[PDB]
Design a protein around this ligand. Structure first.
Ligand SMILES: O=C(O)CNC(=O)C(=O)O
Ligand SMILES: O=C(O)CNC(=O)C(=O)O
Ligand SMILES: [Mn+2]
Ligand SMILES: [Mn+2]
Lengths: 211, 19, 215, 19
């Protein structure tokens, strides 16, 4: 906790606004999370990803993933709940050290699946309008992901610089990045089932101001 | 503007955290 | 010659890959003159925000952040752009019967376009996804000494069904062809320098007739 | 669907060509 956050995540986020942490929970835990996610999927509960400003009943061409929201307390999602407790633990031991954000909230966990067949997510910013979301956290579940065959790279375009950051959706990888217009990003077309769990953390002041 | 047409829906519930 | 290029290079590349790049299309001098005419169009405040087929917000920079102006080619002061359009049209009409089943019998005006650096671009999209008649997209680029590493603005095409993509630098005097429909989703990645290009879309007779009935 | 929300407007005019 304190170790990894204060000594790795905090510096990387303040300097670059993007932090990758590999082997976050380990193969055993990662694999159990994978099983719980795929179970949720096989129920058929997943629905089409929604946009903040939705205009058409179908919007696959904007984001083509199917998702489901998990609180972490659902009977049967105990290992996802553990993932969430780990994330929350880190984030709370970050307060006061992540730029100037005072994190005091989060969304539910978004379990998302791009079902191959070229689906993806066009370039966008998570928090456009100051809705409080300050840190985006994504946990990836994809073993032996070969982007050269399956695609589904997450390409982030750090605002101000032509350079970009390509992130493979690798198994047991934990990604942090600023949710606002600093980090516009896209999921490039995927040609294999692409699983990930996302949590958005809210900034106290910005969230209160937004409401 | 059109930025929210592309932005991921955050849902409606926020879970208190940290303090 | 336009003809030998169309039959020997354009048609095979389009039919086998749906994408065709022709570098040094008109040459240095003519290309420069086109640059002058577009920059003049720009300096005279003629450009306005790019529009989408079904717009919902009046400001849509985050979908496409380019400034636009439609040119017929006959406007006094646009003679060299008119010559470009004549070249392109001459080329396309000598392709009919050799682009699969497409019979091109129409085109849009020329869309002169500027991305004014500052990270502007165009998210991944499909030019023609409801069957509006547009079969071929044609783009002439005017950006001399374009260093994508510092200026960005690469056009990434994502050929459908394959993990591959094609990165097109907007190099000066480059002419690009590609199928307009859902086979070629593509995006203009953020540009940090002024990015100019002229686009013509060509219509298929049958598909455009159908489209007229549908609309 | 939302595809036309992203597609570039074609203009109001089609110019005849070829035949
Ligand atoms: O899944 C990923 O890597 C990226 N996902 C998103 O950009 C999103 O859902 O908002
Ligand atoms: O300008 C480019 O490289 C590509 N342009 C477009 O995709 C467009 O205007 O629809
Ligand atoms: Mn996102
Ligand atoms: Mn286009």
């Amino acid at each position: 906790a304190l170790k990894l956050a204060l000594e790795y995540i905090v510096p990387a986020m303040n300097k670059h606004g993007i932090c990758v942490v590999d082997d976050f929970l380990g193969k055993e835990t990662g694999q159990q999370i994978g099983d719980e996610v795929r179970a949720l999927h096989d129920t058929g509960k997943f629905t089409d990803g929604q946009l903040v400003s939705q205009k058409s009943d179908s919007s696959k061409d904007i984001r083509g993933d199917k998702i489901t929201w998990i609180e972490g307390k659902e009977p049967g999602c105990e290992t996802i709940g553990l993932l969430m407790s780990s994330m929350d633990d880190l984030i709370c031991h970050c307060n006061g050290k992540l730029g100037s954000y005072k994190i005091n909230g989060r969304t539910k966990a978004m379990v998302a699946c791009y079902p191959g067949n070229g689906t993806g997510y066009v370039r966008h910013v998570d928090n456009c309008n100051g809705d409080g979301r300050c840190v985006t956290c994504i946990y990836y579940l994809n073993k032996d992901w070969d982007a050269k065959v399956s695609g589904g790279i997450l390409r982030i375009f750090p605002e101000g610089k032509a350079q970009f950051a390509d992130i493979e959706p690798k198994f047991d990888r934990l990604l942090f990045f600023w949710s606002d217009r600093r980090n516009p990003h896209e999921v490039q077309p995927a040609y294999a089932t692409r699983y990930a769990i996302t949590v958005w953390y809210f900034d106290a002041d910005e969230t209160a101001a937004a409401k | 503007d059109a930025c929210t047409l592309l932005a991921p829906a955050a849902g409606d519930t926020i879970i208190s955290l940290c303090f």
